Amino acid sequence: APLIVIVPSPGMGHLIPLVEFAKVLVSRFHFSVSLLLPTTAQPTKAQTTLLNSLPSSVSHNFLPTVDPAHLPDGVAHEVTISLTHAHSLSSIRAALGSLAQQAQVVALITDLFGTGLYTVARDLGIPPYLYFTSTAMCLLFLFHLPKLDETVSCEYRDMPEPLVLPGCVPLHGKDFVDPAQDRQDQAYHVLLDHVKRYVLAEGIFVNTFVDLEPGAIKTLQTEDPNVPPVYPVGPIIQSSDCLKWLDRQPSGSVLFVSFGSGGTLSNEQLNELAIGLEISGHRFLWVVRSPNDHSSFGSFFSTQSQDDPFGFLPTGFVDRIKDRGLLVPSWAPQIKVLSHGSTGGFLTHCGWNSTLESIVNGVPLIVWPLYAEQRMNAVMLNQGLKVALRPNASQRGLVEADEIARVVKELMDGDEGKKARYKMRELSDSAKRVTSENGESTKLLSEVASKWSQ
């Protein structure tokens, strides 16, 4: 069985998407997958349990640890990730040498930060590939980032005019990816360094489909012959008290409100959201992430009782919404919620994983972007595809409760919500088509895989 080697960037956040890709490869084709994992620490229980859950065709090997002592403190995560790859490069070469004894290595696939491996792979006669985990629009943006860096002198937020990528919605500088928001930080230079090596990939898989991003994909595929082949092969997505609650609600009636593991809002903003949800009169499932108590000088909290996770919310709020709302602390089974017939909307931070789950389930959005490339995704979903509504922020940047109620009602009962819902269902239909047995996404992946089987 020919062997595909996959090298995820360190951290669960990078492991998960590539593990999903690994599962797709071994389930659809006659391939073995070997995960080589650069690391700065011993496996956690969570990573161990994920890796042990994989089929026998997928093996994994933690590389010799890079000591965090040999890494700079106080740098952005992207820098840490990049340096970890660099320090593991020798190990990966040795592992590839070892694996070549056991099987023929037909391909090497790495995340947007594994680009240092591509030359190494070419020299060993292994075609290297990028599994790109954001939008085609985001990839297009990155391919233009070198030219942008040269011709633009200010911080991108200070740009007078939005950037218009061919076939894409206009994109203001303040909505550029988070690594590019500070040109003075090492993270920015790291992103640039890796982007400049995308051209060395044999091909780039993007977790998207043509009908979703016709413009961006077309540009990527025909604007510049230098850019490697771009393969849209998505959507690829994974796959409990709140589900019991959802079961009891009418069909299409619940606004699911959830930011991710990494997004959190201010107390002031959470309170406007709570009151806005209440006054909308609509049903809602809200995954709440408590704001971390900020301990100013002279302040002393109580260890007497467990923090009520909802203690920060307005007095009487919880009692008032008992008829129509459920508050869930920290985590909910997102896919199950999005696929549940009771769910009629999703207030989301527009992470691509979350977005894709929503698209395949035909759930329209209220967009509330926070970090990474979310603001770019929000503009794409709202202005471009029109499958999302967007509340107007105040001059300060706070979204008021009256505005939140307006947009919740617009999505749930309003005509704009009807329009967004129909467009989202269209995309849901396309998504099901392209990933079917004979679908465009299925066929393309299969076509690329076939050259690995020789």
Short mmCIF file of C-alpha atoms in Angstrom, two decimals:
data_model
loop_
_atom_site.label_atom_id
_atom_site.label_comp_id
_atom_site.label_asym_id
_atom_site.label_seq_id
_atom_site.Cartn_x
_atom_site.Cartn_y
_atom_site.Cartn_z
CA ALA A 1 0.00 0.00 0.00
CA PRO A 2 1.54 3.37 -1.06
CA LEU A 3 2.18 5.78 1.81
CA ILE A 4 1.09 9.40 2.16
CA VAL A 5 3.03 11.41 4.73
CA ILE A 6 1.23 14.26 6.50
CA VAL A 7 3.02 16.81 8.69
CA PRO A 8 0.58 18.99 10.71
CA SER A 9 1.78 22.12 12.45
CA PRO A 10 1.97 21.66 16.28
CA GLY A 11 -1.22 22.11 18.29
CA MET A 12 -4.68 20.51 18.22
CA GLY A 13 -5.94 23.43 16.10
CA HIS A 14 -3.72 22.28 13.22
CA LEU A 15 -3.89 18.53 13.89
CA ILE A 16 -7.69 18.28 13.68
CA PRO A 17 -8.23 19.51 10.05
CA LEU A 18 -5.38 17.40 8.66
CA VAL A 19 -6.57 14.36 10.63
CA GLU A 20 -9.95 14.82 8.92
CA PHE A 21 -8.15 14.96 5.57
CA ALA A 22 -6.22 11.79 6.50
CA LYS A 23 -9.52 10.02 7.26
CA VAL A 24 -10.91 11.04 3.86
CA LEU A 25 -7.80 9.73 2.05
CA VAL A 26 -7.72 6.28 3.68
CA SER A 27 -11.49 5.79 3.46
CA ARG A 28 -11.78 6.65 -0.24
CA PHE A 29 -8.48 5.26 -1.56
CA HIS A 30 -5.95 2.46 -1.13
CA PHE A 31 -3.42 4.54 0.79
CA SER A 32 -1.60 4.35 4.09
CA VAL A 33 -1.18 7.63 5.96
CA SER A 34 1.73 8.38 8.30
CA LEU A 35 1.38 11.42 10.57
CA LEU A 36 4.72 12.98 11.53
CA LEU A 37 4.11 15.39 14.41
CA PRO A 38 6.66 18.13 15.30
CA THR A 39 6.16 19.00 18.97
CA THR A 40 7.40 21.09 21.90
CA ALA A 41 5.81 18.84 24.55
CA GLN A 42 4.73 15.28 25.35
CA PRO A 43 1.33 14.18 23.92
CA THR A 44 -1.68 15.42 25.90
CA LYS A 45 -4.58 13.10 26.75
CA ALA A 46 -6.68 14.93 24.13
CA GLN A 47 -4.16 14.45 21.33
CA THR A 48 -3.48 10.83 22.36
CA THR A 49 -7.20 10.04 22.37
CA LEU A 50 -7.69 11.65 18.95
CA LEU A 51 -4.74 9.83 17.37
CA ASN A 52 -5.70 6.46 18.89
CA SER A 53 -9.22 6.82 17.45
CA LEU A 54 -7.88 6.78 13.87
CA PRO A 55 -8.04 3.67 11.60
CA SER A 56 -5.11 1.22 11.39
CA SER A 57 -4.17 2.63 7.96
CA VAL A 58 -3.29 5.93 9.71
CA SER A 59 -0.18 5.71 11.89
CA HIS A 60 1.43 8.53 13.88
CA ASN A 61 4.94 9.36 15.10
CA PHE A 62 5.78 12.18 17.52
CA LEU A 63 9.15 13.58 16.46
CA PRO A 64 11.96 14.30 19.00
CA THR A 65 10.70 17.18 21.13
CA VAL A 66 11.94 20.71 20.48
CA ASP A 67 12.75 22.16 23.92
CA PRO A 68 10.72 25.41 24.43
CA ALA A 69 13.85 26.71 26.21
CA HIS A 70 15.52 26.90 22.78
CA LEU A 71 12.59 28.96 21.46
CA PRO A 72 11.97 32.73 21.98
CA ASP A 73 9.50 33.87 24.65
CA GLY A 74 6.80 36.48 24.04
CA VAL A 75 6.41 35.76 20.31
CA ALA A 76 3.19 35.11 18.38
CA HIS A 77 2.02 31.50 17.96
CA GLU A 78 2.77 31.54 14.22
CA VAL A 79 6.43 32.25 15.03
CA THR A 80 6.56 29.41 17.58
CA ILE A 81 4.96 27.07 15.02
CA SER A 82 7.39 28.10 12.27
CA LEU A 83 10.46 27.65 14.49
CA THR A 84 9.21 24.26 15.70
CA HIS A 85 9.02 23.08 12.07
CA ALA A 86 12.55 24.38 11.44
CA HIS A 87 13.96 22.60 14.50
CA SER A 88 12.20 19.36 13.49
CA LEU A 89 13.41 19.43 9.87
CA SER A 90 16.27 16.96 10.44
CA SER A 91 13.91 14.60 12.29
CA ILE A 92 11.43 14.68 9.39
CA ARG A 93 14.21 13.90 6.90
CA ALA A 94 15.27 10.92 9.05
CA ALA A 95 11.67 9.72 9.44
CA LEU A 96 11.15 9.96 5.67
CA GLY A 97 14.33 7.90 5.19
CA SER A 98 13.00 5.28 7.63
CA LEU A 99 9.54 5.20 6.03
CA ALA A 100 11.07 4.70 2.55
CA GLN A 101 12.29 1.29 3.82
CA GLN A 102 8.78 0.21 4.83
CA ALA A 103 6.86 1.56 1.80
CA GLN A 104 7.06 3.95 -1.17
CA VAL A 105 6.20 7.53 -0.17
CA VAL A 106 3.95 8.90 -2.93
CA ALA A 107 3.09 12.32 -1.45
CA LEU A 108 3.82 14.72 1.40
CA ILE A 109 1.04 17.03 2.68
CA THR A 110 1.58 19.93 5.17
CA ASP A 111 -0.36 22.93 6.62
CA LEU A 112 0.28 26.57 5.67
CA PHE A 113 3.23 26.60 8.11
CA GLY A 114 4.95 23.42 6.90
CA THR A 115 6.37 25.06 3.76
CA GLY A 116 10.00 24.53 4.82
CA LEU A 117 9.55 20.82 4.02
CA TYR A 118 8.70 21.31 0.37
CA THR A 119 12.27 21.66 -0.97
CA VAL A 120 13.31 18.71 1.22
CA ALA A 121 10.48 16.61 -0.25
CA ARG A 122 11.35 17.55 -3.85
CA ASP A 123 14.96 16.49 -3.25
CA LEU A 124 13.79 13.08 -2.00
CA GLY A 125 11.53 12.84 -5.07
CA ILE A 126 8.32 13.22 -3.05
CA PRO A 127 5.71 15.69 -4.43
CA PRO A 128 4.74 18.12 -1.59
CA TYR A 129 1.20 19.49 -1.23
CA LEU A 130 -0.48 22.26 0.75
CA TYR A 131 -3.76 21.49 2.47
CA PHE A 132 -5.12 25.02 2.80
CA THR A 133 -7.65 25.37 5.59
CA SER A 134 -9.20 28.76 4.76
CA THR A 135 -11.26 30.16 1.88
CA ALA A 136 -10.10 30.33 -1.74
CA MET A 137 -10.53 34.09 -1.27
CA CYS A 138 -8.10 33.93 1.67
CA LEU A 139 -5.58 31.98 -0.42
CA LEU A 140 -5.93 34.52 -3.24
CA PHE A 141 -5.30 37.32 -0.72
CA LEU A 142 -2.10 35.63 0.48
CA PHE A 143 -0.77 35.20 -3.09
CA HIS A 144 -1.16 38.98 -3.51
CA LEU A 145 0.33 39.77 -0.10
CA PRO A 146 3.97 39.95 -1.42
CA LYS A 147 2.99 42.54 -4.06
CA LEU A 148 0.86 44.37 -1.47
CA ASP A 149 3.80 44.46 0.95
CA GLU A 150 5.97 46.11 -1.73
CA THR A 151 3.51 48.71 -3.01
CA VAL A 152 1.91 49.68 0.33
CA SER A 153 3.82 51.60 2.99
CA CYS A 154 1.21 52.19 5.71
CA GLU A 155 -0.38 49.68 8.06
CA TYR A 156 -3.14 48.05 5.99
CA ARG A 157 -5.86 49.41 8.31
CA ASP A 158 -4.76 52.91 7.25
CA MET A 159 -5.16 52.17 3.53
CA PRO A 160 -7.51 54.81 1.98
CA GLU A 161 -9.19 52.34 -0.39
CA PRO A 162 -10.35 48.68 -0.14
CA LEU A 163 -8.49 46.00 -2.10
CA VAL A 164 -10.42 44.32 -4.92
CA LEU A 165 -9.11 40.84 -5.76
CA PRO A 166 -10.28 39.66 -9.23
CA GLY A 167 -13.73 38.06 -8.88
CA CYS A 168 -13.99 38.90 -5.17
CA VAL A 169 -15.93 41.32 -2.96
CA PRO A 170 -13.94 44.49 -1.99
CA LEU A 171 -11.83 44.01 1.15
CA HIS A 172 -10.77 46.86 3.45
CA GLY A 173 -7.29 46.80 5.00
CA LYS A 174 -8.74 46.50 8.52
CA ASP A 175 -10.37 43.22 7.45
CA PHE A 176 -7.08 41.67 6.28
CA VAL A 177 -5.81 38.54 8.13
CA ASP A 178 -4.75 39.05 11.79
CA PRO A 179 -1.04 38.25 11.12
CA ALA A 180 -0.94 41.19 8.59
CA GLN A 181 -2.58 43.63 11.05
CA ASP A 182 0.84 44.54 12.52
CA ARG A 183 3.61 44.82 9.92
CA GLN A 184 6.13 45.46 12.72
CA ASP A 185 5.60 42.06 14.38
CA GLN A 186 7.63 38.92 13.59
CA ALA A 187 4.39 37.03 12.82
CA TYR A 188 3.87 39.15 9.70
CA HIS A 189 7.36 38.37 8.38
CA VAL A 190 6.78 34.67 9.09
CA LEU A 191 3.50 34.63 7.13
CA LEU A 192 5.24 36.33 4.17
CA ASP A 193 8.11 33.81 4.28
CA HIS A 194 5.75 30.83 4.08
CA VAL A 195 3.45 32.45 1.49
CA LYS A 196 6.47 32.98 -0.78
CA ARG A 197 6.98 29.21 -0.68
CA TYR A 198 3.42 28.27 -1.68
CA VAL A 199 4.71 28.32 -5.27
CA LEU A 200 6.91 25.31 -4.45
CA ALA A 201 3.89 23.08 -3.75
CA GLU A 202 2.97 20.48 -6.38
CA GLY A 203 -0.67 21.38 -5.66
CA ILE A 204 -2.93 23.18 -3.17
CA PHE A 205 -6.05 21.52 -1.79
CA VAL A 206 -8.62 24.04 -0.56
CA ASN A 207 -11.53 23.00 1.68
CA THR A 208 -14.09 24.73 -0.57
CA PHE A 209 -16.15 24.18 -3.74
CA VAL A 210 -16.66 26.04 -7.02
CA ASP A 211 -20.25 27.27 -6.51
CA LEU A 212 -19.18 28.67 -3.13
CA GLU A 213 -16.33 30.83 -4.43
CA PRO A 214 -16.62 30.92 -8.28
CA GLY A 215 -14.72 34.20 -8.54
CA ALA A 216 -11.76 33.46 -6.24
CA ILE A 217 -11.27 29.93 -7.59
CA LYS A 218 -11.39 31.11 -11.22
CA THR A 219 -8.74 33.77 -10.50
CA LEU A 220 -6.57 31.26 -8.63
CA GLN A 221 -6.84 28.77 -11.50
CA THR A 222 -6.23 31.15 -14.47
CA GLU A 223 -4.85 34.61 -13.41
CA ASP A 224 -1.23 33.52 -12.91
CA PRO A 225 0.35 30.31 -14.35
CA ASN A 226 3.04 30.53 -11.63
CA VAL A 227 0.50 29.62 -8.90
CA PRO A 228 0.40 25.80 -8.39
CA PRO A 229 -2.76 23.85 -9.40
CA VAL A 230 -5.57 24.69 -6.97
CA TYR A 231 -7.93 21.83 -6.09
CA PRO A 232 -11.30 22.68 -4.41
CA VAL A 233 -12.20 19.41 -2.69
CA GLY A 234 -14.69 20.54 -0.03
CA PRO A 235 -16.75 20.69 1.99
CA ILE A 236 -14.80 18.36 4.26
CA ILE A 237 -16.30 18.44 7.76
CA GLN A 238 -16.20 16.13 10.79
CA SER A 239 -18.93 13.54 11.41
CA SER A 240 -25.55 16.87 24.69
CA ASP A 241 -28.27 18.17 27.08
CA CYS A 242 -29.04 21.00 24.58
CA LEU A 243 -30.01 18.43 21.88
CA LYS A 244 -32.76 17.24 24.31
CA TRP A 245 -33.93 20.86 24.54
CA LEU A 246 -33.78 21.32 20.74
CA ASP A 247 -35.91 18.18 20.27
CA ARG A 248 -38.72 19.97 22.13
CA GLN A 249 -38.65 23.11 19.96
CA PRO A 250 -40.49 23.71 16.63
CA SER A 251 -38.70 23.22 13.31
CA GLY A 252 -36.48 26.09 12.13
CA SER A 253 -37.26 28.20 15.20
CA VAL A 254 -33.98 28.36 17.17
CA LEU A 255 -31.13 30.85 16.74
CA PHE A 256 -27.94 29.02 17.69
CA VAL A 257 -25.47 31.50 19.19
CA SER A 258 -21.90 30.26 19.51
CA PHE A 259 -18.42 31.68 19.24
CA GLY A 260 -15.67 29.06 19.20
CA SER A 261 -13.06 27.89 21.69
CA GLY A 262 -10.94 31.03 21.10
CA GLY A 263 -13.49 33.86 20.74
CA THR A 264 -14.64 35.86 23.78
CA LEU A 265 -16.42 39.23 24.09
CA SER A 266 -16.41 41.99 26.72
CA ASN A 267 -18.88 41.95 29.63
CA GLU A 268 -20.57 45.07 28.22
CA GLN A 269 -21.03 43.40 24.81
CA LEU A 270 -22.18 40.08 26.30
CA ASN A 271 -24.85 42.03 28.26
CA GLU A 272 -26.08 43.80 25.08
CA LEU A 273 -26.26 40.35 23.42
CA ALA A 274 -28.25 38.92 26.37
CA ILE A 275 -30.79 41.76 26.35
CA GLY A 276 -30.92 41.77 22.54
CA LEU A 277 -31.66 38.03 22.51
CA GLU A 278 -34.35 38.53 25.17
CA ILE A 279 -36.14 41.41 23.46
CA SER A 280 -36.11 39.67 20.05
CA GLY A 281 -38.71 37.29 21.49
CA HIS A 282 -37.19 34.46 19.42
CA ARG A 283 -35.93 31.09 20.67
CA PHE A 284 -32.18 30.68 21.18
CA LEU A 285 -29.47 28.27 22.26
CA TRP A 286 -26.51 30.31 23.49
CA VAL A 287 -23.12 28.75 24.24
CA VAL A 288 -21.72 31.21 26.81
CA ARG A 289 -18.02 31.77 27.52
CA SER A 290 -17.61 33.62 30.81
CA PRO A 291 -15.27 36.67 30.71
CA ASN A 292 -12.12 35.89 32.70
CA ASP A 293 -12.14 37.91 35.95
CA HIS A 294 -9.58 40.69 35.50
CA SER A 295 -7.91 41.20 38.86
CA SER A 296 -7.04 44.87 39.35
CA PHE A 297 -5.04 46.05 42.37
CA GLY A 298 -7.05 45.76 45.60
CA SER A 299 -9.72 43.41 44.22
CA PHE A 300 -10.44 40.09 45.96
CA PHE A 301 -12.86 37.46 44.63
CA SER A 302 -14.75 34.78 46.59
CA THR A 303 -13.62 31.15 46.83
CA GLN A 304 -16.68 30.43 49.01
CA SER A 305 -19.01 29.33 46.19
CA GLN A 306 -18.30 28.15 42.65
CA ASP A 307 -18.54 31.01 40.18
CA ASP A 308 -22.03 30.87 38.72
CA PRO A 309 -21.06 30.69 34.99
CA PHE A 310 -24.01 32.98 34.22
CA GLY A 311 -23.33 35.24 37.23
CA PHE A 312 -21.99 38.01 34.96
CA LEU A 313 -25.28 38.32 33.03
CA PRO A 314 -27.97 40.98 33.84
CA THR A 315 -30.11 40.35 36.93
CA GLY A 316 -33.28 38.37 36.21
CA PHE A 317 -32.25 37.66 32.58
CA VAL A 318 -31.99 33.89 33.07
CA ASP A 319 -35.42 33.69 34.74
CA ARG A 320 -37.09 35.82 32.06
CA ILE A 321 -36.01 33.67 29.09
CA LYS A 322 -36.90 30.24 30.57
CA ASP A 323 -39.83 29.83 28.13
CA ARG A 324 -37.77 30.31 24.93
CA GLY A 325 -34.02 30.21 25.63
CA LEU A 326 -31.32 27.81 26.83
CA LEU A 327 -27.85 28.91 28.05
CA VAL A 328 -25.14 26.24 27.77
CA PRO A 329 -21.77 26.85 29.43
CA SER A 330 -18.59 26.68 27.29
CA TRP A 331 -19.31 23.86 24.82
CA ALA A 332 -22.09 22.38 22.63
CA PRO A 333 -22.02 19.61 19.92
CA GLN A 334 -21.97 22.09 17.05
CA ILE A 335 -22.51 19.71 14.11
CA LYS A 336 -25.48 18.06 15.82
CA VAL A 337 -26.96 21.48 16.59
CA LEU A 338 -26.46 22.76 13.03
CA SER A 339 -28.02 19.59 11.56
CA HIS A 340 -30.97 19.61 13.98
CA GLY A 341 -34.30 20.50 12.35
CA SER A 342 -35.12 22.98 15.14
CA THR A 343 -32.13 25.22 14.28
CA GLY A 344 -33.18 28.12 12.04
CA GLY A 345 -30.13 30.41 12.34
CA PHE A 346 -26.50 30.64 13.50
CA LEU A 347 -24.87 33.70 15.09
CA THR A 348 -21.23 32.85 14.40
CA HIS A 349 -17.72 34.30 14.40
CA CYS A 350 -17.33 32.98 10.81
CA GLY A 351 -14.50 30.53 11.42
CA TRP A 352 -14.26 28.51 8.21
CA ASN A 353 -14.92 25.16 9.91
CA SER A 354 -18.07 26.59 11.52
CA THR A 355 -19.13 28.26 8.26
CA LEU A 356 -18.74 25.04 6.25
CA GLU A 357 -20.80 23.10 8.82
CA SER A 358 -23.50 25.78 8.51
CA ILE A 359 -23.38 25.74 4.70
CA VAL A 360 -23.81 21.98 4.43
CA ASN A 361 -26.80 22.17 6.80
CA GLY A 362 -28.41 25.17 5.06
CA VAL A 363 -28.42 27.33 8.21
CA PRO A 364 -28.24 31.10 7.43
CA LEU A 365 -25.97 33.32 9.51
CA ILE A 366 -25.60 36.43 11.56
CA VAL A 367 -21.90 37.22 11.18
CA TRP A 368 -19.89 38.39 14.20
CA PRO A 369 -16.17 38.07 13.30
CA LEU A 370 -13.39 38.16 15.91
CA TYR A 371 -9.85 36.88 15.06
CA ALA A 372 -7.72 35.22 12.32
CA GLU A 373 -9.42 35.78 8.88
CA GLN A 374 -13.04 36.00 10.23
CA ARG A 375 -13.68 39.62 9.21
CA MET A 376 -12.76 38.69 5.62
CA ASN A 377 -15.08 35.65 5.77
CA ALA A 378 -17.87 37.83 7.19
CA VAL A 379 -17.64 40.30 4.30
CA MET A 380 -17.64 37.36 1.87
CA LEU A 381 -20.71 35.68 3.39
CA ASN A 382 -22.66 38.90 3.94
CA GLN A 383 -21.88 41.09 0.92
CA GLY A 384 -20.71 38.39 -1.51
CA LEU A 385 -22.96 35.34 -1.06
CA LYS A 386 -25.77 37.11 0.84
CA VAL A 387 -26.29 34.13 3.16
CA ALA A 388 -25.54 36.17 6.27
CA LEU A 389 -26.92 39.22 8.04
CA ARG A 390 -24.72 41.70 9.87
CA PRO A 391 -25.60 44.05 12.79
CA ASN A 392 -24.41 47.65 12.61
CA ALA A 393 -21.88 48.50 15.31
CA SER A 394 -22.00 51.89 17.13
CA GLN A 395 -19.25 54.52 16.69
CA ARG A 396 -17.45 53.02 19.75
CA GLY A 397 -17.79 49.56 18.06
CA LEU A 398 -20.29 48.06 20.55
CA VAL A 399 -23.36 46.34 19.08
CA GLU A 400 -26.40 47.64 20.98
CA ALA A 401 -29.20 45.32 22.22
CA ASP A 402 -31.82 47.11 20.05
CA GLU A 403 -29.64 46.43 16.96
CA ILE A 404 -29.13 42.75 17.99
CA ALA A 405 -32.90 42.26 18.42
CA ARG A 406 -33.50 43.87 15.00
CA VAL A 407 -31.10 41.50 13.25
CA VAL A 408 -32.33 38.42 15.14
CA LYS A 409 -35.91 39.21 14.04
CA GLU A 410 -34.74 39.98 10.49
CA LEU A 411 -33.07 36.57 10.25
CA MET A 412 -35.83 34.55 12.00
CA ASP A 413 -38.99 36.27 10.57
CA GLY A 414 -37.82 39.08 8.25
CA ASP A 415 -37.64 39.15 4.46
CA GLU A 416 -33.84 39.59 4.50
CA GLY A 417 -33.68 36.39 6.58
CA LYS A 418 -35.90 34.65 4.02
CA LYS A 419 -33.57 35.75 1.21
CA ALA A 420 -30.45 34.66 3.12
CA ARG A 421 -32.16 31.36 4.01
CA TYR A 422 -33.00 30.55 0.37
CA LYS A 423 -29.46 31.34 -0.81
CA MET A 424 -27.99 29.22 2.01
CA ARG A 425 -30.25 26.31 1.04
CA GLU A 426 -29.03 26.69 -2.57
CA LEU A 427 -25.42 26.41 -1.33
CA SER A 428 -26.46 23.45 0.85
CA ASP A 429 -27.80 21.73 -2.28
CA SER A 430 -24.60 22.44 -4.24
CA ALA A 431 -22.48 21.25 -1.30
CA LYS A 432 -24.35 17.92 -1.30
CA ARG A 433 -23.93 17.64 -5.09
CA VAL A 434 -20.18 18.34 -5.26
CA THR A 435 -19.36 15.78 -2.54
CA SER A 436 -21.58 13.03 -3.97
CA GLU A 437 -20.12 9.92 -5.66
CA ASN A 438 -19.84 11.69 -9.02
CA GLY A 439 -19.63 15.23 -7.61
CA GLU A 440 -17.06 17.78 -8.76
CA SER A 441 -15.16 17.83 -5.44
CA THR A 442 -15.12 14.02 -5.13
CA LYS A 443 -13.91 13.60 -8.71
CA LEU A 444 -11.12 16.17 -8.48
CA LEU A 445 -9.64 14.65 -5.31
CA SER A 446 -9.89 11.21 -6.92
CA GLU A 447 -8.11 12.52 -10.04
CA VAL A 448 -5.18 13.85 -7.98
CA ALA A 449 -5.05 10.69 -5.85
CA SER A 450 -4.89 8.50 -8.98
CA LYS A 451 -1.52 9.96 -9.98
CA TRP A 452 -0.19 8.89 -6.55
CA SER A 453 -1.19 5.28 -7.29
CA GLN A 454 0.82 5.52 -10.54
#
